[PDB]
PDB file of N, CA and C in Angstrom:
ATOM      1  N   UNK P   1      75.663 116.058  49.838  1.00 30.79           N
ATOM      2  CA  UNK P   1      77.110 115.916  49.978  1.00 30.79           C
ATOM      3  C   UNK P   1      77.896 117.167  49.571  1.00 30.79           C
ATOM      4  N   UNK P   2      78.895 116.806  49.767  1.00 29.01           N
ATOM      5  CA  UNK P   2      80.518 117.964  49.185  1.00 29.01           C
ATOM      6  C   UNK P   2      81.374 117.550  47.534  1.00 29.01           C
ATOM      7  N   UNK P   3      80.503 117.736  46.571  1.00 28.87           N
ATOM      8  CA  UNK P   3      81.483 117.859  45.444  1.00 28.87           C
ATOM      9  C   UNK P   3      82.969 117.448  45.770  1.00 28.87           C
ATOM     10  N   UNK P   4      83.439 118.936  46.456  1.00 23.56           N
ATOM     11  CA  UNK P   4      85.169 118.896  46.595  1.00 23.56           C
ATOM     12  C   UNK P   4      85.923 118.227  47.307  1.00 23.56           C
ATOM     13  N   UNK P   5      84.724 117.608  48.684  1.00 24.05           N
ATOM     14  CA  UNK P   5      85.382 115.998  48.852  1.00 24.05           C
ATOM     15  C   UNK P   5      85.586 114.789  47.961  1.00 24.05           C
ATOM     16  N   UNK P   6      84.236 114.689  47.221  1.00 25.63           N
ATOM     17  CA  UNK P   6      84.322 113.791  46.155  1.00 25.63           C
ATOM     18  C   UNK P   6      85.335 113.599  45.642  1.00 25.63           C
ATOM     19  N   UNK P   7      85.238 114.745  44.782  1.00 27.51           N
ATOM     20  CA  UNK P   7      85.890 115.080  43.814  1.00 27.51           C
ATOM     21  C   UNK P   7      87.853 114.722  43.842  1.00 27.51           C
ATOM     22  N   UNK P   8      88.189 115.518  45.148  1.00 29.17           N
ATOM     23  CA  UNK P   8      89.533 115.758  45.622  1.00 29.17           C
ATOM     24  C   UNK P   8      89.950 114.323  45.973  1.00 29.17           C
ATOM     25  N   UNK P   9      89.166 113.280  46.414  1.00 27.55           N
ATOM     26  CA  UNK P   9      89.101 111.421  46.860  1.00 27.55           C
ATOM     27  C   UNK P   9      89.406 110.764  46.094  1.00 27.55           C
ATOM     28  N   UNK P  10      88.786 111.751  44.871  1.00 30.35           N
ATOM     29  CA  UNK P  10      88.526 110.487  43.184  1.00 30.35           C
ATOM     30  C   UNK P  10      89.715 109.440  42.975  1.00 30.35           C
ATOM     31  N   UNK P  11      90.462 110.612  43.016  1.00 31.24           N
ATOM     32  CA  UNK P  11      92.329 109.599  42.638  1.00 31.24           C
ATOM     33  C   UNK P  11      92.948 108.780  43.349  1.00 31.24           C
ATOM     34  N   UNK P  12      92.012 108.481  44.701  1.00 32.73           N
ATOM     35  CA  UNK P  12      91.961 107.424  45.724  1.00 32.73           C
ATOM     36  C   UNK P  12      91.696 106.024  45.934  1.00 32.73           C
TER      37      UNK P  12
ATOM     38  N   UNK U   1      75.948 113.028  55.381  1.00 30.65           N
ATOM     39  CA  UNK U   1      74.707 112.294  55.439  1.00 30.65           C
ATOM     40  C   UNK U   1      74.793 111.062  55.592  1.00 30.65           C
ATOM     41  N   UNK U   2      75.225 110.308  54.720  1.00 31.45           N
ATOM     42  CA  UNK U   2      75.901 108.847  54.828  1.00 31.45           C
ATOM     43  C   UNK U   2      77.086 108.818  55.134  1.00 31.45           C
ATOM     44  N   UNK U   3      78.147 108.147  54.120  1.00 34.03           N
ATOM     45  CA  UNK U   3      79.399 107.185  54.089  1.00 34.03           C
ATOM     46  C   UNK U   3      80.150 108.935  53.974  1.00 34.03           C
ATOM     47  N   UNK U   4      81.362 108.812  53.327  1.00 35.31           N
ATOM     48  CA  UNK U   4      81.682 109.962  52.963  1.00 35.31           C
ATOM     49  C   UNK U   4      82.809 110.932  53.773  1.00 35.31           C
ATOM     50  N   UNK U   5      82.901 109.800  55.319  1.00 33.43           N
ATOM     51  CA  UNK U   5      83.315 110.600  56.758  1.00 33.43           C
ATOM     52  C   UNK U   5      84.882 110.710  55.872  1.00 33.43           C
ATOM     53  N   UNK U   6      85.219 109.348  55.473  1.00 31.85           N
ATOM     54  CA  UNK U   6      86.736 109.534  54.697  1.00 31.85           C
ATOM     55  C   UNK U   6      87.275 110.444  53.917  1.00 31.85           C
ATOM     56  N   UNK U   7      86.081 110.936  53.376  1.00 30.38           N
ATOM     57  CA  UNK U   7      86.271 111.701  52.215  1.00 30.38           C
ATOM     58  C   UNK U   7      86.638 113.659  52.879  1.00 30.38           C
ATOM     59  N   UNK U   8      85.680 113.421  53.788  1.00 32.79           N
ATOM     60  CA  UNK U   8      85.778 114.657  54.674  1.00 32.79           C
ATOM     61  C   UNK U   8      86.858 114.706  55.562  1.00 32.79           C
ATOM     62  N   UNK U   9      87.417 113.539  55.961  1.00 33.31           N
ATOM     63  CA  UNK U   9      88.817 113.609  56.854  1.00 33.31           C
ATOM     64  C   UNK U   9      89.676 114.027  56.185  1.00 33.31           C
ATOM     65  N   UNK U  10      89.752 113.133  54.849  1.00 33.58           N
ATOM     66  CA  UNK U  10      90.639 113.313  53.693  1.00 33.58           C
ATOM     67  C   UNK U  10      90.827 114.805  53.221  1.00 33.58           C
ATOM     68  N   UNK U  11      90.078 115.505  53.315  1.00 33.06           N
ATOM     69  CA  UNK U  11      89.952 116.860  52.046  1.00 33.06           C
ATOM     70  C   UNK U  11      90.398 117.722  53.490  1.00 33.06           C
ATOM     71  N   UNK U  12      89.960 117.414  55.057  1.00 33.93           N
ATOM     72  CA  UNK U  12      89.964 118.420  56.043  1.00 33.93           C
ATOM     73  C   UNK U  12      91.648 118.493  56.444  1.00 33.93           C
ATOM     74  N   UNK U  13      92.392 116.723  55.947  1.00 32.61           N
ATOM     75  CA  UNK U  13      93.826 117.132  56.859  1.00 32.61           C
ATOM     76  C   UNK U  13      94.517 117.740  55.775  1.00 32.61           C
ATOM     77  N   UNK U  14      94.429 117.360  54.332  1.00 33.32           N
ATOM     78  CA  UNK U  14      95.385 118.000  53.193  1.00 33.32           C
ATOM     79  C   UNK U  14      95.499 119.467  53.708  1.00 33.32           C
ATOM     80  N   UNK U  15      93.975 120.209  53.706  1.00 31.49           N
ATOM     81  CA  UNK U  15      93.997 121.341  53.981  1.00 31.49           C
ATOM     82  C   UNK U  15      94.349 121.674  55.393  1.00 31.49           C
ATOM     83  N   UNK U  16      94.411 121.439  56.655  1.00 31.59           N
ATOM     84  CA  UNK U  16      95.135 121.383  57.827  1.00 31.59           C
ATOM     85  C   UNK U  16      96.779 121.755  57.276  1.00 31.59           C
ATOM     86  N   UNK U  17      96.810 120.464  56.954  1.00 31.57           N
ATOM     87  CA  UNK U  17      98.502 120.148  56.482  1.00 31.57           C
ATOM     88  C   UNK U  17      99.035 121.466  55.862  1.00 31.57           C
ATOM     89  N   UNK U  18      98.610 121.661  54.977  1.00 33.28           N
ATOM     90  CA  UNK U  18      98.810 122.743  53.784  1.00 33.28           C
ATOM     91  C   UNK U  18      99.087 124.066  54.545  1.00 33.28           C
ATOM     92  N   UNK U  19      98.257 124.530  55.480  1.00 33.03           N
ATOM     93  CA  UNK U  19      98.023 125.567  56.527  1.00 33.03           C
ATOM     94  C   UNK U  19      99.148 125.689  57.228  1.00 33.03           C
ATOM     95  N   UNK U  20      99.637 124.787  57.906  1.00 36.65           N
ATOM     96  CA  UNK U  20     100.477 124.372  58.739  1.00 36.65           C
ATOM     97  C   UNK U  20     101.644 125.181  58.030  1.00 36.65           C
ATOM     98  N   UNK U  21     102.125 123.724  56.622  1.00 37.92           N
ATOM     99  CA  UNK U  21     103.481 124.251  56.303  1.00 37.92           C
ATOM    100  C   UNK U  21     103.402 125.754  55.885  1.00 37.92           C
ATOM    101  N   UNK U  22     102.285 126.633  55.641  1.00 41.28           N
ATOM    102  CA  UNK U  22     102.532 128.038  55.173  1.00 41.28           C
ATOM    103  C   UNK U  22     102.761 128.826  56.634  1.00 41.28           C
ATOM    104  N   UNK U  23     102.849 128.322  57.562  1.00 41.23           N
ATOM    105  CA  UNK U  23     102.466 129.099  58.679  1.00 41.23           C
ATOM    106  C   UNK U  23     104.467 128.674  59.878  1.00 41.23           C
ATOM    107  N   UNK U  24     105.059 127.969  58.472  1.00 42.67           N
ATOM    108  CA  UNK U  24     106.316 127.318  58.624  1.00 42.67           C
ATOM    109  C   UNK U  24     106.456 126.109  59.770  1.00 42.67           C
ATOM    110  N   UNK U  25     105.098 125.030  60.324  1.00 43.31           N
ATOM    111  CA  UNK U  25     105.258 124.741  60.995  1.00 43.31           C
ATOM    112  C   UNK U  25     105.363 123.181  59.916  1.00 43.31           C
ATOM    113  N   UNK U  26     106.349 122.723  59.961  1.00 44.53           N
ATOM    114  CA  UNK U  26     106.827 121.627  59.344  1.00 44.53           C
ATOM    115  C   UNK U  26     106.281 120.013  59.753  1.00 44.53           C
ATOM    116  N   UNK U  27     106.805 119.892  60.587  1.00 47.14           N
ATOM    117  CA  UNK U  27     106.527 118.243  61.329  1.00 47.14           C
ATOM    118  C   UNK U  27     104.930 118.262  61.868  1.00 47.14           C
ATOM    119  N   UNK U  28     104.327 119.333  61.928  1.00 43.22           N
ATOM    120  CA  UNK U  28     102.745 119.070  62.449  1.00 43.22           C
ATOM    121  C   UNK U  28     101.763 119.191  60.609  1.00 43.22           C
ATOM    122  N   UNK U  29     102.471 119.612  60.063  1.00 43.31           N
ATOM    123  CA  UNK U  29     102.155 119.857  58.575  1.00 43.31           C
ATOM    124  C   UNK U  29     101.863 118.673  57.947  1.00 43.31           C
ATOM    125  N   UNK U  30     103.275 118.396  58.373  1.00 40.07           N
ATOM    126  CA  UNK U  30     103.857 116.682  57.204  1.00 40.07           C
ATOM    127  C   UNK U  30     103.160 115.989  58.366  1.00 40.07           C
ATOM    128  N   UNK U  31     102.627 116.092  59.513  1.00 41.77           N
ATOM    129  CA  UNK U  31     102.111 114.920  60.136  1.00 41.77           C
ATOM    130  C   UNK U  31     100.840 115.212  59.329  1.00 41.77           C
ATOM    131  N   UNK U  32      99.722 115.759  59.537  1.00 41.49           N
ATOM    132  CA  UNK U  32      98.494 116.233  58.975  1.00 41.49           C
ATOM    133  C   UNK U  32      98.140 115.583  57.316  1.00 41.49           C
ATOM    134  N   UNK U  33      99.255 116.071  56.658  1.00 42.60           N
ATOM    135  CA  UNK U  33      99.247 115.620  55.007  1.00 42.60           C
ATOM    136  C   UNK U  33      99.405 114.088  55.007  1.00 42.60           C
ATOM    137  N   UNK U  34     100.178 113.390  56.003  1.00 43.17           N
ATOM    138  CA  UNK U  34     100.547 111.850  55.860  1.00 43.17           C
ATOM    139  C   UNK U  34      99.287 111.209  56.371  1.00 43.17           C
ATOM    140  N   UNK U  35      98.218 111.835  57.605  1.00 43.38           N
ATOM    141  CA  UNK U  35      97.028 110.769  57.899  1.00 43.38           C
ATOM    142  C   UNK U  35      96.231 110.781  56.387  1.00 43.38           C
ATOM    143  N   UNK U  36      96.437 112.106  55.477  1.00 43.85           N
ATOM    144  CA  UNK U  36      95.527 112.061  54.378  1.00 43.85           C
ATOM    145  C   UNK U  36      95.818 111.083  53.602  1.00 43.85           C
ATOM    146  N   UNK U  37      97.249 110.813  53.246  1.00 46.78           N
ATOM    147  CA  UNK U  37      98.029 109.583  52.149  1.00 46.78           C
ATOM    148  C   UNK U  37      97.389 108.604  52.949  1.00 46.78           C
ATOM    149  N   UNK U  38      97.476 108.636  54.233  1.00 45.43           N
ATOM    150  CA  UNK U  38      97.313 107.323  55.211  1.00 45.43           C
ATOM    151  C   UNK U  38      95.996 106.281  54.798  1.00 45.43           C
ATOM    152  N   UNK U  39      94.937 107.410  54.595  1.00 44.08           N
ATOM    153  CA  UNK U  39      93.589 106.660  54.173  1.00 44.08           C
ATOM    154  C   UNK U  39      93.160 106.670  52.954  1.00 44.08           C
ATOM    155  N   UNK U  40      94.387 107.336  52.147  1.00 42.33           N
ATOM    156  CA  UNK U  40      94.201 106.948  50.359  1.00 42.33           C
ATOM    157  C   UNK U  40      94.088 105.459  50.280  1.00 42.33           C
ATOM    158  N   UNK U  41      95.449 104.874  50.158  1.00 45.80           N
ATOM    159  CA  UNK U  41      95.575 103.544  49.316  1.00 45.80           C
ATOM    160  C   UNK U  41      96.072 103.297  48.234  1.00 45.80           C
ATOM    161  N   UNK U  42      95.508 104.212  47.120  1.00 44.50           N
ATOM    162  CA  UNK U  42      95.963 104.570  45.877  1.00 44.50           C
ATOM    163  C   UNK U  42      96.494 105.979  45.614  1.00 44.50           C
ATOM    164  N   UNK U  43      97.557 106.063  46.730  1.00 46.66           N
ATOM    165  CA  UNK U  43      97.561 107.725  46.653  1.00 46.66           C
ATOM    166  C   UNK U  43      99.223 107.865  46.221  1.00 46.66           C
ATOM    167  N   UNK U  44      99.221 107.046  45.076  1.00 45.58           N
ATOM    168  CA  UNK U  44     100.607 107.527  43.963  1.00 45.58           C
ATOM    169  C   UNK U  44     100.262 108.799  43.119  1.00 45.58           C
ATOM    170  N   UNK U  45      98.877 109.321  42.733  1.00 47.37           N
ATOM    171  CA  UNK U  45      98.269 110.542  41.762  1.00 47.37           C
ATOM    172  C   UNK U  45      98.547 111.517  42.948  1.00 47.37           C
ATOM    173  N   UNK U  46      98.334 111.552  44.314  1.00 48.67           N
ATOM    174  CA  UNK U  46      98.552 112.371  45.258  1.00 48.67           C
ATOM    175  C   UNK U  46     100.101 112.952  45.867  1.00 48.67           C
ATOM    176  N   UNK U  47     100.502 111.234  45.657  1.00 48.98           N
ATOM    177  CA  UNK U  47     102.256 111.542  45.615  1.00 48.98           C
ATOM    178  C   UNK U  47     102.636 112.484  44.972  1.00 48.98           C
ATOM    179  N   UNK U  48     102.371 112.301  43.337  1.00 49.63           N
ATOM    180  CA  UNK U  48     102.752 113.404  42.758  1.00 49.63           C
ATOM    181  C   UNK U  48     102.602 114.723  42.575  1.00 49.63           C
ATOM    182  N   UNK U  49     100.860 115.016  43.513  1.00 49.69           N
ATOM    183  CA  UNK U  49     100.800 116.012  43.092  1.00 49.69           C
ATOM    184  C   UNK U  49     101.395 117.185  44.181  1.00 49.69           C
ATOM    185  N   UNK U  50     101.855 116.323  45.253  1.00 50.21           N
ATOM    186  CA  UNK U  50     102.797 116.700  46.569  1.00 50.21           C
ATOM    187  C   UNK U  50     104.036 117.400  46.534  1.00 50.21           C
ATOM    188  N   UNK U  51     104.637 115.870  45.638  1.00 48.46           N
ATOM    189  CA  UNK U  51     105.940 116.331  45.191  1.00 48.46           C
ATOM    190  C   UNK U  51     106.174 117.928  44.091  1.00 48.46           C
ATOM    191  N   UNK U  52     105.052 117.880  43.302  1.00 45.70           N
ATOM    192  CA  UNK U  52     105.336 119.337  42.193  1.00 45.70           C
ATOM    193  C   UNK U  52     104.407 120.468  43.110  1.00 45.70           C
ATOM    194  N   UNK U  53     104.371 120.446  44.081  1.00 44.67           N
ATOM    195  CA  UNK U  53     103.541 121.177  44.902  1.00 44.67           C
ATOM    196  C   UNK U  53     104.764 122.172  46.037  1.00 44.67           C
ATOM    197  N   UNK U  54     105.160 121.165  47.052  1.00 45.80           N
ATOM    198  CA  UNK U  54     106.435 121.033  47.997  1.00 45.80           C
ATOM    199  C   UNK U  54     107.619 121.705  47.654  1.00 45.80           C
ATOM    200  N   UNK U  55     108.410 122.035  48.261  1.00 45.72           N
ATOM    201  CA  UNK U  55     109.728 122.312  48.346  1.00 45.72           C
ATOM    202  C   UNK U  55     110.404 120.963  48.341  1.00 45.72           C
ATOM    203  N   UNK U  56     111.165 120.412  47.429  1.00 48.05           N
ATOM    204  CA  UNK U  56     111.882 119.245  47.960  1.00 48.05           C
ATOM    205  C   UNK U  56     112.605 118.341  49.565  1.00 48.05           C
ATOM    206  N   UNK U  57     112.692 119.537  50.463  1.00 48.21           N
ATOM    207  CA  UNK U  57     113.449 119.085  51.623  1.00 48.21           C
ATOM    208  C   UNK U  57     111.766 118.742  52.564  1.00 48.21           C
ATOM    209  N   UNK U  58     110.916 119.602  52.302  1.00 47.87           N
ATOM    210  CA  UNK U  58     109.614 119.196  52.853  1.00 47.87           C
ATOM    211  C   UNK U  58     108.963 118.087  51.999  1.00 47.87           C
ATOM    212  N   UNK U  59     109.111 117.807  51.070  1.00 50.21           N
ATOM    213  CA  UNK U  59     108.636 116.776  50.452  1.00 50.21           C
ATOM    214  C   UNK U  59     109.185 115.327  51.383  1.00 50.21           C
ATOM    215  N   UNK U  60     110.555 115.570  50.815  1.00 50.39           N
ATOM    216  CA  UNK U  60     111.315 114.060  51.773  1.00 50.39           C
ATOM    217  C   UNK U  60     111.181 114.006  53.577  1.00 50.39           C
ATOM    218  N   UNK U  61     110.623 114.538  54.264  1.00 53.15           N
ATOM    219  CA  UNK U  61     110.125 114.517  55.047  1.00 53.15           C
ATOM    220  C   UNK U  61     109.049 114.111  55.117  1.00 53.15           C
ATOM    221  N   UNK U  62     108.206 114.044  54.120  1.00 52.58           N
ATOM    222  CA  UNK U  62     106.878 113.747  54.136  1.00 52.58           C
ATOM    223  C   UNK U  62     106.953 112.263  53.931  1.00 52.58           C
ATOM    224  N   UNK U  63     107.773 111.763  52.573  1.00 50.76           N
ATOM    225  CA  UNK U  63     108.157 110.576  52.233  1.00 50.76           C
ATOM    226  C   UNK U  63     108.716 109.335  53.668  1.00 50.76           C
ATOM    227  N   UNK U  64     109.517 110.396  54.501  1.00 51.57           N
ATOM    228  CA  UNK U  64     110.274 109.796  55.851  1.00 51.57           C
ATOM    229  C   UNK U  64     109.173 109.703  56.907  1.00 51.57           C
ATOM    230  N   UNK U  65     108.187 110.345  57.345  1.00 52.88           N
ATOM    231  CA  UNK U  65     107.276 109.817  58.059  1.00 52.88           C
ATOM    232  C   UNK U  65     105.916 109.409  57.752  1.00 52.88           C
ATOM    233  N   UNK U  66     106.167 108.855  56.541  1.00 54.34           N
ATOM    234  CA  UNK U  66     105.043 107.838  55.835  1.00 54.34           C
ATOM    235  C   UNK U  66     105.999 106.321  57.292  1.00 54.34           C
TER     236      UNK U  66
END
């Protein structure tokens, strides 16, 4: 996967 | 690989969006940034981080075609 998708989703 | 397509739409239009308004194109910008809110849900942490991000008159535009 992409960390900075994860990541950037989290607060989703 | 799997699930995740959201996550990649998500991270691909912010940054679209973002592009856009530096490039002064407004309404294809704020369209781009709103499919991203679109498939949040919980995207009040995103609201904000829009609003201290934005110019205010591009902000409420963004707010108006939610």
């Amino acid at each position: 996967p992409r960390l900075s998708r994860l990541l950037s989703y989290a607060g989703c | 690989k799997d699930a995740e397509a959201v996550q990649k739409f998500f991270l691909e239009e912010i940054q679209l969006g973002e592009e856009l308004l530096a490039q002064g194109d407004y309404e294809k910008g704020v369209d781009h940034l709103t499919n991203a809110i679109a498939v949040c849900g919980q995207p009040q942490q995103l609201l904000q981080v829009l609003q201290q991000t934005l110019p205010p008159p591009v902000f409420q535009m963004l707010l108006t075609k939610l």
